[PDB]
Scaffold this active site. Structure first.
Site, PDB file in Angstrom:
ATOM      1  N   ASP A   1      -3.217   2.679  -5.688  1.00 28.63           N
ATOM      2  CA  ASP A   1      -2.196   2.589  -4.648  1.00 28.63           C
ATOM      3  C   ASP A   1      -2.126   1.293  -3.821  1.00 28.63           C
ATOM      4  OD1 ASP A   1      -3.999   2.978  -2.369  1.00 28.63           O
ATOM      5  OD2 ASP A   1      -4.055   5.070  -2.954  1.00 28.63           O
ATOM      6  N   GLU A   2      -2.738   0.217  -4.323  1.00 29.74           N
ATOM      7  CA  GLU A   2      -2.766  -1.076  -3.634  1.00 29.74           C
ATOM      8  C   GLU A   2      -2.575  -2.220  -4.588  1.00 29.74           C
ATOM      9  OE1 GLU A   2      -6.396  -1.608  -1.449  1.00 29.74           O
ATOM     10  OE2 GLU A   2      -5.738  -0.191   0.083  1.00 29.74           O
TER      11      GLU A   2
ATOM     12  N   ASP B   1       0.811  -1.214   0.000  1.00 28.49           N
ATOM     13  CA  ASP B   1       0.000   0.000   0.000  1.00 28.49           C
ATOM     14  C   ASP B   1       0.855   1.280   0.000  1.00 28.49           C
ATOM     15  OD1 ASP B   1      -1.308   1.960   2.495  1.00 28.49           O
ATOM     16  OD2 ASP B   1      -2.401   1.754   0.571  1.00 28.49           O
TER      17      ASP B   1
HETATM   18 CA   LIG Z   1      -4.864   2.111   0.130  1.00 23.24          CA
END
Ligand SMILES: [Ca+2]
Ligand SMILES: [Ca+2]
Length: 341
Positions: free
Chosen positions: A105-106, A7
DNA sequence: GGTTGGATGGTAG
DNA sequence: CTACCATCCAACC
């Protein structure tokens, strides 16, 4: 058997800090400015300097700025952010091909083919962290565990620039001691709805009837939390295909006039087609948010792909149908594309 | 059970 | 705020 989740820390605010070093160790607020008045819009992300004092994603700008004048407010740049993101997912791809990109973002990596236990997992996790920081200059958090949810949770525990392994006995104490609020995929609307009834921890979901839980929070969430509270969650690291690409834009004043809405609608189509990029949707939906924030949709499915001009022409008719059916003025307008080929 | 229609509701950056 | 998905209430092959 082993999952590795990554993350990107306060991602939007972080790219900005890397591109523009005049900003670091200071409060930095990434915003969406709606377009109407001054301060019109909402916070999209904020570094931890901005978060300690309640400036976080979701809140309006006029509330962020009253809670903190002071800070550094910045127009969002999704293109710039997406560029960095695509590159980082490319690094991650080299550590394992089984990768679930869950968002800008993951990502989830299944490493049950590359390591033997968690110890070899932690080494690899530091390694990935180190390569990313060297190539991009981005701090990231890694969670490791046995299913996806517990890998994400582990990352949630370590967050700012951290690494954490949740082994087998720790998973069991978490089921009894973790709030429902801190469960990936369970927001504050669901948490507090269950909170009222004394359902506070994950184990409590096994103390209540399924139709009672179903009739309260719905199908998926009911089966999801029940799996997890038993320890029967382990669904595969599956590839993610986008179902729909669409754009919505805000007008500067409410209008029921066909000719005044058109410019905004057409501006949505252009940007939406930009985003499709070589993809070809068989179906299209026009979304209008009315005077009192009420949502109205008309769409249409085709036995063929939709060309850019067909959308123009079809989207106009879907906006007509709305206007004959609803006597309220429209405040925002946009389009959605789906059922790709 | 599947497609396709439209409605608020929810989660996340 | 914007983006994308889910949930449900419906007609009908
Ligand atoms: Ca996230
Ligand atoms: Ca159904």
């Amino acid at each position: 058997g082993i999952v590795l989740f990554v993350d990107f820390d306060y991602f939007y605010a972080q790219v900005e800090e890397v591109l523009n070093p005049s900003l670091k160790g200071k409060p930095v607020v990434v915003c969406v400015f709606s377009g109407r008045f001054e301060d019109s819009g909402a916070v999209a992300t904020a570094n931890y300097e901005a978060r300690k004092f309640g400036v976080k994603a979701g809140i309006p700008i006029v509330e962020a700025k009253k809670i903190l004048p002071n800070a550094v407010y910045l127009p969002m740049r999704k293109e710039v952010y997406q560029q960095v993101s695509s590159r980082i997912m490319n690094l991650l791809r080299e550590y394992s091909e089984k990768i679930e990109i869950a968002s800008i973002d993951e990502a989830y990596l299944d490493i049950s083919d590359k390591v033997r236990d968690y110890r070899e997992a932690y080494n690899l996790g530091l390694e990935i962290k180190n390569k990313i920081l060297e190539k991009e200059k981005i701090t990231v958090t890694v969670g490791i565990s046995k299913n996806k949810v517990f890998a994400k949770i582990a990352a949630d525990m370590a967050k700012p620039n951290g690494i954490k392994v949740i082994d087998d006995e720790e998973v069991k104490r978490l089921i009894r001691e973790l709030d429902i609020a801190d469960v990936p995929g369970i927001g504050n609307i669901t948490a507090e709805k269950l909170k009222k009834l004394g359902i506070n921890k994950l184990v409590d979901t096994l103390s209540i009837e399924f139709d009672k839980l179903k009739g309260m929070i719905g199908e998926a969430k009911a089966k999801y939390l029940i799996s997890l509270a038993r320890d029967e969650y382990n669904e595969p690291i599956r590839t993610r295909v986008r179902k729909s690409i669409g754009r919505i834009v805000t007008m500067k004043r409410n209008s029921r006039n066909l000719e005044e809405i058109k410019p905004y609608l057409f501006r949505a189509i252009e940007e939406s087609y930009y985003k499709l990029d070589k993809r070809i949707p068989k179906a299209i939906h026009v979304v209008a948010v009315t005077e009192d924030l009420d949502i109205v949709s008309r769409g249409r499915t085709f036995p063929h792909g939709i060309s850019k001009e067909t959308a123009y022409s079809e989207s106009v008719k879907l906006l007509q149908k709305i206007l004959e059916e609803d006597e309220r003025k429209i405040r925002r307008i946009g389009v959605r594309f789906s059922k790709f080929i």
